Design an enzyme around this catalytic site. Sequence first.
Site, short mmCIF file in Angstrom:
data_model
loop_
_atom_site.label_atom_id
_atom_site.label_comp_id
_atom_site.label_asym_id
_atom_site.label_seq_id
_atom_site.Cartn_x
_atom_site.Cartn_y
_atom_site.Cartn_z
N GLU A 66 -9.50 1.03 8.16
CA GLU A 66 -9.72 0.81 6.74
C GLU A 66 -9.60 -0.68 6.42
O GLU A 66 -10.43 -1.23 5.68
CB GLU A 66 -8.72 1.63 5.93
CG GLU A 66 -9.30 2.20 4.61
CD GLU A 66 -9.50 1.13 3.55
OE1 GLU A 66 -8.56 0.34 3.32
OE2 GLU A 66 -10.59 1.08 2.93
N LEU B 179 0.84 -1.18 0.00
CA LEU B 179 0.00 0.00 0.00
C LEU B 179 0.88 1.25 0.00
O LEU B 179 2.00 1.22 0.51
CB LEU B 179 -0.92 0.01 1.22
CG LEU B 179 -1.93 -1.15 1.30
CD1 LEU B 179 -2.79 -1.04 2.54
CD2 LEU B 179 -2.81 -1.19 0.05
#
Length: 187
Positions: free
Chosen positions: A31, A23
């Site tokens: 999240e 990421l």
Amino acid sequence: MVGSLNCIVAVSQNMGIGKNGDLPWPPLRNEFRYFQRMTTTSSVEGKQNLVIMGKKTWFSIPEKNRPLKGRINLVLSRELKEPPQGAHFLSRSLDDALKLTEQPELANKVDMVWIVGGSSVYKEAMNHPGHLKLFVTRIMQDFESDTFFPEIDLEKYKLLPEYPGVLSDVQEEKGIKYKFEVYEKND
Ligand SMILES: NC(=O)c1ccc[n+]([C@@H]2O[C@H](COP(=O)([O-])OP(=O)(O)OC[C@H]3O[C@@H](n4cnc5c(N)ncnc54)[C@H](OP(=O)(O)O)[C@@H]3O)[C@@H](O)[C@H]2O)c1
Ligand SMILES: CCc1nc(N)nc(N)c1OCCCCOc1ccccc1CCc1nnn[nH]1
Ligand SMILES: [Cl-]
Ligand SMILES: [Cl-]
Ligand SMILES: [Cl-]
């Protein structure tokens, strides 16, 4: 039969979703919890959801967490001859994967279908005709990225003001603000 067709993604302001196999932002616990709850939760007793992912997304998950627990996992690749270790399904395209969901081995086991990345997986889905929802986390910062989320065609999709079970207000973790959005089309 099989349930709804959905994409889920987290996207930075510069439309980035990944960087060097990871990421672009530091981990955002909630999240992740939202991603896990959304893709795992099934409306139908006795059924599990199917998650469809590209090959690089598969190998970006730590080995201890593959396959994604409580979900049927399917990987897209034209180069792999067999599902990678820990997976049991492998298709040459999203279209093939969806056709696979009507064979007996999947039809009566699968509720919702969740496309979880990466870029070329989203792209094939957002071209696919029919009823589609995009669950988009808008990360409200730029992050250096090397793989991106295709821009949404607002002539096909509606942005829903609220979606059941999804908070519509600004989130914040680790100094990073973000919002949960849900788009829908029905071609
Ligand atoms: N922010 C998010 O929501 C999110 C979600 C997922 C991943 N990520 C991050 O993005 C990166 C991984 O995604 P990525 O875009 O680079 O790679 P990816 O899409 O996960 O994998 C790419 C490979 O998977 C196959 N593939 C992809 N789409 C296909 C399709 N429609 N049909 C058939 N095969 C397909 C191809 O494998 P073959 O070459 O073997 O044919 C392709 O080379 C990582 O950094 C990850 O951490 C972020
Ligand atoms: C949470 C990011 C995300 N969010 C939304 N909304 N949609 C997506 N498709 C999405 O990507 C999911 C990528 C595939 C699942 O990845 C897993 C699974 C378990 C453990 C580690 C990882 C690696 C990514 C990671 N997440 N947190 N730390 N590392
Ligand atoms: Cl998960
Ligand atoms: Cl469940
Ligand atoms: Cl967009």
